[model samples]
Target: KVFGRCELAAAMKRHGLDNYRGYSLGNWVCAAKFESNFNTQATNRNTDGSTDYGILQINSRWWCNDGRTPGSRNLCNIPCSALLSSDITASVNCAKKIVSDGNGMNAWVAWRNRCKGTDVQAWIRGCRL
Candidate 1:
């Protein structure tokens, strides 16, 4: 399920991602734009054989367990596939858990490289949320 930009912003807002851990909603939305472009089916595999799953691209080695990443912590204890669901509830929750795990939004390198220090509000400026 691919989501429109505002649709994703509204959804993330509902999950309290806005201002979560001091990162604004635009930050989250921006991260998603770079990470997966709001495509729920997006997946990318790292050289370590660990896969990133879902729109937020939760990692298999640290967040979700794909049952393949070596020594996976599965901190969220969620299957990687679960994060790909269109509902996004599990994705949003795991994202919160990830940020709260002390990494903050820096966990997403895409966010750090692109969203951080940028005019992130433009990501949500036209949204009615």
Candidate 2:
């Protein structure tokens, strides 16, 4: 879901990340810029005009079904509505879970390889969780 600073702060609080506002802001900003340029309503259409929707640039056709469910994803266990809500905590929690569960970012060296250029691990290490 889309969220601003205050909302993100509140959400982070619920996720036990109240003290890591700076880190959240930094990470969110970077991801947004790199991923979707902060456009929550952004969509991508293929040559056939099939649609992929949402801020995270989710491919609805592949992950969801239109008319069957408003907000849903077949690939992710959690429904798309949860991802589309304004509660960034949900997204962050999901991301954390994915990363910790040996199938997400932390499980892959590519993310760290990319981070090596910016030394993000050191920054994360210094963050107050």
Candidate 3:
């Protein structure tokens, strides 16, 4: 629900995500663009019945517990619903943990498929961050 790229970037920066796990702010912005278009309430169900939650689309298969999904590792120890809130501190914290786990941004398929190695400057273009 963030209205602009600059707004989202500022919020991310406030959460210390501007340079998380050695990844750049542009990387996070680009991945988020494709993952959920910056919509915090975004959710997508995988073909395998697992679901992705929040702007980063953290998966129920590994990151969060959805209660409906079985065998969720819930590595973030958070409910999937928590990621859908407008306040993204929990989501940001979980994302940092994910990156720290060594996956980097590659844990997000959107980043690998769309943002990786692509021109991402526009994601932060005109932003005063």
lDDT of each: 0.92, 0.43, 0.87
lDDT of 1: 0.92
Error of 3 at 14 (Å): 0.7
Q: Which of 1 and 3 is the better model by TM-score? A: 1
TM-score of 1: 0.97
Total colliding residue pairs, candidate 2: 0
TM-score of each: 0.97, 0.43, 0.94
Tens digits of per-residue lDDT for model 2 on 19-128?
24233334433343344444454556545444444434444434544434435445544554555555454445555444444443432233334432464433234334
What does the lDDT read for residue 48 in candidate 1?
Answer: 88
Instruction: Spell out the clash pairs found in candidate 3.
Output: none
Highest TM-score against the true fold, candidate: 1
Global Cα lDDT for candidate 2: 0.43
The TM-score, computed over Cα atoms with residue i paired to residue i, of candidate 2 is 0.43
| Runs in model 2 lying further than 4 Å from the true structure | 1-14, 17-25, 39-76, 103-116, 119-129
Model 1 alpha-carbon drift over 4 Å, by segment? none
- Window of ten residues with lowest summed lDDT in model 1: 64-73
Preferred candidate (lDDT higher): 1 or 2: 1
How well does candidate 3 score on lDDT at residue 114? 95
